[PDB]
Amino acid sequence: FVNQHLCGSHLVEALYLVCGERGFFYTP
Amino acid sequence: QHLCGSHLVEALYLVCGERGFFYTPK
Amino acid sequence: QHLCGSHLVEALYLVCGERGFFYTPK
Amino acid sequence: FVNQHLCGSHLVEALYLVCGERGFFYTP
Amino acid sequence: FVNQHLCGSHLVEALYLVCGERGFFYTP
Amino acid sequence: QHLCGSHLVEALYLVCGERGFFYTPK
Amino acid sequence: IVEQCCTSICSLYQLENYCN
Amino acid sequence: GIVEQCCTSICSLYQLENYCN
Amino acid sequence: IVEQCCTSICSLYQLENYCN
Amino acid sequence: GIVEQCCTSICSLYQLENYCN
Amino acid sequence: IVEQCCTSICSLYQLENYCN
Amino acid sequence: GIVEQCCTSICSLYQLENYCN
Ligand SMILES: NCCc1c[nH]c2ccc(O)cc12
Ligand SMILES: NCCc1c[nH]c2ccc(O)cc12
Ligand SMILES: NCCc1c[nH]c2ccc(O)cc12
Ligand SMILES: [Cl-]
Ligand SMILES: [Cl-]
Ligand SMILES: [Zn+2]
Ligand SMILES: [Zn+2]
């Protein structure tokens, strides 16, 4: 969950771009 | 400073990233 | 949204990063 | 190749800044 | 110190946002 | 290109991140 | 959020209102 | 469980799209 | 690319055209 | 020693604030 | 720095002047 | 093999510059 936190930073950035106007949810 | 596009999501992750959050533009 | 400078490279890495890509501004 | 993928995100960002107008190539 | 370098990239970005007008220092 | 806000800090980390640095806006 | 934070300015504390 | 799925293997774009709203 | 995507807008799918 | 403290566990915001000027 | 690099332009080499 | 070289040790700037066009 430290390598994962960092990875979380990358995921929400990927989701920002993938989802666009729909937006997303993020939740460990 | 103004938090826009990708930087707003990064700011959201700095504050809520342990506890999750929702990002809904409209 | 407009993908400019560093964010265009990040968008390129989201799509092609498994398979590689070229970034040539001019 | 998961720690590396994340690392790849950092590298192409470093190359964006290092290369400038020349640009770069990235390829695993 | 490679997983840490990557982590350093995340920290100075977190500090950029946390500190604001005060600014920060970063040093391994 | 212009290095502003978060991107200036990232540029600083590309150059000084092994050796540390100070970021002081004013 | 994109008005609260992109259009108008916002703190990191105001952002804590958007978490889960 | 996006952390569980996608910080383990390299998720696809269609995979990341399950977390869109 | 910087016209396709910075100047004009582009999708992530249009970006798939630039991969290797 | 921010690398030592904060690349080990998930530091808090108040924790990261000790490195503000 | 934010004048040297945001307002005016700067290199990555000019940035080396800000390190420790 | 930039992943191989530069996700192993901390590459230098001159090292990363071999992948410029
Ligand atoms: N198909 C790779 C897309 C992608 C971009 N960034 C990522 C981060 C984590 C992940 O599992 C996947 C990705
Ligand atoms: N409380 C989590 C804040 C945070 C955001 N990014 C981080 C990176 C490293 C760290 O130790 C902590 C953080
Ligand atoms: N000399 C450190 C430059 C640098 C910045 N970001 C990096 C990421 C990976 C790497 O191997 C090297 C770097
Ligand atoms: Cl990382
Ligand atoms: Cl920007
Ligand atoms: Zn990272
Ligand atoms: Zn930006």
Author numbering:
A (entry chain D), D (entry chain D), E (entry chain D): 1 to 28
B (entry chain B), C (entry chain B), F (entry chain B): 4 to 29
G (entry chain A), I (entry chain A), K (entry chain A): 2 to 21
H (entry chain C), J (entry chain C), L (entry chain C): 1 to 21
Extract from the study:
Insulin is one of the key human protein hormones that is responsible for the maintenance of metabolic homeostasis, with an influence on cell proliferation and regulation of aging. Insulin is a 51-amino acid protein consisting of two disulfide-linked chains (A1-A21, B1-B30) and exerts its functions through binding as a monomer to the (αβ)2 heterodimer tyrosine-kinase-type insulin receptor (IR)5 (10, 11). Insulin is produced from a single chain pro-insulin and stored in pancreatic β-cells in storage granules (termed large dense core vesicles (LDCVs)) from which it is released into the bloodstream in response to elevated blood glucose levels. The in vitro data showed that insulin hexamers can be grouped into three structurally distinct states/families: T6, T3Rf3, and R6 (15, 16), which differ by the conformation of the B1-B6 N termini of the hormone B-chain.
The crystal structure of insulin grown in the presence of serotonin and Zn2+ revealed a T3R3 hexamer (referred to here as InsSerT3R3), with six neurotransmitters and two Zn2+ ions per hexamer. The hexamer quaternary structure is indeed T3R3 as the B1-B3 N termini acquire here a more R-like (fully α-helical) fold rather than an Rf, “frayed,” conformation observed in T3Rf3 oligomers. Coordination of both Zn2+ ions is tetrahedral regardless of the R or T protein environment with axial Cl− ligands. Serotonin occupies six sites in InsSerT3R3: three phenol “main” sites I and three hexamer surface sites III. It is tethered into site I via (typical for phenolic ligands) HBs of its OH group to -CO of CysA6 (range of 2.41–2.43 Å) and to -NH of CysA11 (2.93–3.17 Å); a weaker HB -OH contact to -CO of SerA9 (3.38–3.41 Å) further stabilizes this phenolic anchor. A significant HisB5-Nϵ2·π pyrrole HB (3.46–3.56 Å) contributes to the immobilization of the serotonin indole ring, which is assisted further by more subtle van der Waals (hydrophobic) interactions, especially with LeuB17 (3.45–3.59 Å). The -NζH amino group of this side chain is hydrogen-bonded to Oϵ1 of GluB21 (2.55–2.75 Å) and -CO of CysA11 (2.72–2.79 Å). In contrast to site I, the serotonin-binding mode to site III is rather dynamic, indicating its mobility on the InsSerT3R3 surface. Although serotonin is pincered there in a hydrophobic clamp of TyrA14 (π·π interactions ∼3.5 Å) and the side chain of LeuA13 (from a symmetry related dimer), the ligands' electron density is generally less well defined there. The firmness of serotonin-site I interactions, which is propagated likely toward the N termini of the B-helix, combined also with a very good overall fit of serotonin into site I may be behind the induction of the R (i.e. not Rf) conformation of the T3R3 hexamer.
